[PDB]
Symmetry: D2
């Protein structure tokens, strides 16, 4: 545990498991008060909180289903209540847009319903979460969006997913120019394959694993800690001169 982020308040969406959980634990380890958002798995969120507290950090869990904007509004209603109680204001410093879905389909298999849901959760929700954060973020804050190396490496069997993450990349680079006036940086992290349960079944196939492992310059799968450790830098004061950037965190996958 250290004090790099002492005095700072972070919201991490989708922090009940996987990458978001790792990110949340790393930020709390560095001294931040962390809001652990969950979509519906409350007890997993509570576990993330428990782990943070066990290691001397401060965190709390709040739910919101982000599949509609009424969910975004709910996120901020709860965040406001908890932060007001704990800190005397509804202000915060670090926003991690991590929550997302990623089911596969080729273009010929993609239905309207599937497409619309991918957009609602992965592109629309982060945009509206940022929109509502603007009144709450302090100057010199940090916005980090979790994208995907699928925006750099062609995966036609995930085409709708890739498109939503392409929208996130353009959103990042575009907003960075406006929000730099307030000192707020906006960056994206593009993970490669990372052992989590968005891909537990996909990676269960040994062919798929071999492909996933060997594409990295380091000949291993990524771990949640690999992503969290880069997010910690982007969340910190040290990264003040890096904005609008799409940082690959794939272990040099497909160089």
């Amino acid at each position: 545990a250290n004090s790099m982020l002492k005095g700072k308040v972070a919201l991490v969406t989708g922090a009940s498991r996987g990458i978001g959980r790792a990110i949340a634990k790393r930020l709390a380890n560095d001294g931040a008060l962390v809001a652990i958002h969950y979509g519906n798995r409350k007890e997993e969120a509570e576990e993330t909180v428990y782990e943070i507290q066990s290691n001397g950090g401060s965190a709390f869990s709040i739910g919101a289903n982000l599949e509609s904007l009424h969910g975004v509004e709910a996120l901020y209603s709860s965040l406001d209540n908890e932060l007001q109680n704990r800190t005397g204001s509804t202000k915060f410093d670090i926003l991690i847009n991590n929550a997302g879905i990623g089911p596969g389909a080729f273009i010929e298999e993609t239905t309207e319903q599937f497409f619309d849901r991918m957009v609602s959760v992965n592109a629309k929700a982060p945009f509206f979460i940022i929109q509502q954060a603007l009144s709450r973020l302090r100057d010199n804050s940090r916005i980090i969006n979790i994208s995907s190396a699928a925006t750099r490496i062609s995966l036609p069997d995930f085409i709708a997913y890739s498109m939503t993450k392409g929208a996130i990349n353009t959103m990042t680079f575009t907003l960075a120019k406006q929000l730099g006036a307030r000192g707020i940086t906006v960056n994206a992290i593009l993970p490669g394959f990372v052992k989590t349960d968005m891909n537990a079944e996909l990676l269960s196939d040994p062919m798929m694993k071999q492909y996933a492992t060997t594409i990295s310059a380091f000949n291993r799968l990524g771990e949640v800690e690999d992503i969290a450790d880069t997010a910690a830098f982007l969340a910190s004061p040290d990264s003040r001169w890096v904005t609008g950037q799409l940082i690959d965190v794939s272990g040099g996958s497909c160089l």
Copy 2:
């Protein structure tokens, strides 16, 4: 006289005016049969048809409202009927996804309805237009998506628009890998500022004019023919070894 596209059949979406109309004229000049799609009133499209025919070319118009997928269905029902009678086949060769909208709003001004409409028209429609095209495209066909230089140059005042075009960019590179098995290429053209009747209000302010003029390395506004002339290469057999590419056609804007 160019006969590069003799025997070819092309569909250009949103081709009543502006860039779409110019692409339609150019493709027809090169020998293609051109379906000129329009979203509302036929009169503009019918006048383009008359102009093409007066210059010795072949074209017809088809109306469909692409604000919903029902319009995509109607587009293809009409196209199938027209092509079967005109050519003995429902198959075609060249798909130009030009149809789109581009109103402005900063993130803080962007409503849910505004955002959903941008996605529906600019990302969802081209996606399902391609989906339905695949059973009709011949091998060695060409798909050209009209994107925007706004995906390379930050325009916060058009943020939802930019996001939609970034989604198109990712779709373009992703699908190219899949469709190469059929010799089909998929590319995007990224225009900068182009003079139309439609853009001529944003372009009325002489300050904005000066910015848009001198951003180009050639120090002039783009013209619809500048775009159409690059689309002609991408639609031709000569571009066979170029796929998945985002081709800037901005007169070297902001290099």
Copy 3:
């Protein structure tokens, strides 16, 4: 044969064989007077000329060893003499920087001598060829540099070669901004593997072939015509709004 480039004069470096020969034949086919430069293989250059003339075009061969700037100076002394005789001036319209070398070495195997030679031929010579072309090129001319997809796809066994082509890419994008004032476009073509004798021995190994073939979205090796057909567009008036761009002509290799 056509007249797209009627009245235009082109110089193609390294046109005695391979890609440069293909480019030269395509430009002459479109009506250009083509200067066929060769390093030392005069009879192969004469064959390129013979082939062009057989198909109704106009061309001539001139030698210059580009391994030193005295070679560049010699190139232009001969070009000036021949063009003055044939046209009444030393002006021209299209410059193709194609000539180059590409032997392999990992970083640990690269000597100072090897490195220096790669730079002299592949980076320095094209820069100085362009420098000397500036007094000779008309307004609205075209500069096309042949680079390599090795600038996008990591090939550590060709590291010095890749670095020289990276320098070419930056040179292209940078000069485009200055030369746009005269209407002159500057672009690069990045080929993938193409069956020529820069890689005849490398591809003779069936393992290397399989890799070279299957990385393309089209599951074939590139042909010299694939490169020439893209160069014809970049050389033409149709490409006036495309400048500073690095155009992949690899058949969607490694998307």
Copy 4:
């Protein structure tokens, strides 16, 4: 207090002043033993050493003229001697290729000597510095190449300089694939305008100042610490999953 680099050994080239000196101070602050290389007179480097030591850190200086490969040889002969006595080993952990020059010239002003010197100092030297480093670098080491935003933003008035930095960019991405087998990462930092005593003449013109200031999304000139603070992340164990990347550290210049 940061102890991120405790036990680590770093070499920073051209670290008498400017960015190199700032990186050296920061790395030493984080616990690294720092070799501070200088190209001419020792006094600047020795003063940095004194400053680091006064703040509790460990460092020493080594002189070598990197305008030739003989200087690279001399660098490593001195470094081997120093490290063996200081640490019991010739091995080290962190290589920062910062040494370079950056005089301006348009293409039409660029002499052969000017061009050759730029290559020798900016591309050839870092290449052979890495070559000689590989036998000395431990597994899980870090190589960080200081490049330039001029590879993303066209500066025709620095064209040879830009070309040299594009060569460094390509080398960075290419080598990352090779070196991942040893857990070694290779990345580049691309600064924008940074305030030094060295840049302060180009920056004296208030017109140029205004351009360089407002090009950033943060509307201020870069500072040496802005660069050093990102280098600290790339030098650390936390950046293990980031390799082959060109990280813009320009305060979001020209987004």
